Amino acid sequence: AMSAIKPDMRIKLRMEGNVNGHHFVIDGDGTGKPYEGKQTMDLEVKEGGPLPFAFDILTTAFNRVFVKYPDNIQDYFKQSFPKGYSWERSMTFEDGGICNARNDITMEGDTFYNKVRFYGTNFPANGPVMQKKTLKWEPSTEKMYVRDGVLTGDIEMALLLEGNAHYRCDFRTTYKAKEKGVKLPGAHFVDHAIEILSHDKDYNKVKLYEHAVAHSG
């Protein structure tokens, strides 16, 4: 049988968000190569712009289907389709900032649909997020393992800032296939690299790119 996952897929996304009380809506239109672990999104703020905080804190919320998995590691996410899966994420920043995010991922035809919710709070008014001092996320390694019976990914993240410093964050994401029969994979790692390829001056429009590869170390 031919895989539910097609080698060239489109992506549709809407995020409803609130960071330090600032409400916003962002739409995404993208394409990706699931078996190459590559995807590109064009994002557009639809409400609440210009955003008064660093766009970078949102970008990892804009799907682990787009990972190049070797044949010796079980691919939980590609096995989650056609039905799909969802994830919940906590992001705990070094200065007390805290974000919680969720994505519900479904498939219709050649397109992944993403229903994203994003909540951030406790960011200091003088900190780099509210002051828009971020430059990029550094490439990262996500540790995939089963925690309390649920596939979980832990990441030590780092935002490069203006002025020779990093702003660090702990990610924990829980991943759940909609079909409860999908077998849990063995522990492994996923290397990520996310980058903004271009953006407007006020980040109303952003082009985003991610490359990810799975490995056993």
Numbering used by the authors: 0 to 61, 65 to 219
Per the authors:
Photoconvertible fluorescent proteins (PCFPs) are commonly employed in super‐resolution microscopy techniques such as Photo‐Activated Localization Microscopy (PALM), single‐particle‐tracking PALM (sptPALM) and more recently MINFLUX (Balzarotti et al., 2017). We systematically characterized the maturation speed of mEos‐derived PCFPs in Escherichia coli and found that, in contrast to pcStar and mEosEM, several variants such as mEos2, mEos3.1, mEos3.2, and mEos4b mature extremely slowly. In this work, we present a comprehensive investigation of the maturation speed of PCFPs from the mEos family and propose strategies to considerably reduce the maturation time of the monomeric, bright, and fixation‐resistant mEos4b variant (Paez‐Segala et al., 2015). Through a structure‐guided mutagenesis strategy, we developed a strategy to reduce the day‐long maturation time of mEos4b by nearly two orders of magnitude without significantly impacting its molecular brightness and photophysical performance under single‐molecule imaging conditions.
Similarly, we hypothesized that the L93M mutation, which distinguishes mEos3.2 from pcStar and mEos4b from mEosEM, could be pivotal in the significant reduction in maturation time observed for pcStar and mEosEM. In contrast, the L93M mutant showed a drastically decreased apparent maturation time of approximately 80 min, a more than 20‐fold improvement relative to the mEos4b parent and better than any other L93 substitution we have tested. Despite this improvement, the maturation rate of mEos4b‐L93M remained approximately three‐fold slower compared to that of pcStar or mEosEM, both of which also have a methionine at position 93. As a first step towards further improvements, we sought to understand the rationale behind the observed accelerated maturation for mEos4b‐L93M. The only significant difference (beside the L93M mutation) was the presence of an extra water molecule in the vicinity of the chromophore, which is well ordered as evidenced by the clear electron density map at this position. This water molecule (W1 hereafter) is within hydrogen‐bonding distance of the sulfur atom of M93 and the hydroxyl group of T59. First, the L93M mutation enlarges a hydrophobic pocket adjacent to the chromophore and stabilizes a single ordered water molecule (W1) that bridges T59 and R91, subtly repositioning the catalytic arginine. In both computed structural models, the amide group of Q60 replaces the water molecule W1 observed in the mEos4b‐L93M structure, leading to a similar repositioning of the R91 side chain relative to T59. Significant acceleration of mEos4b maturation was achieved by modifying the immediate environment of R91, a residue known to play a key role in catalyzing maturation.
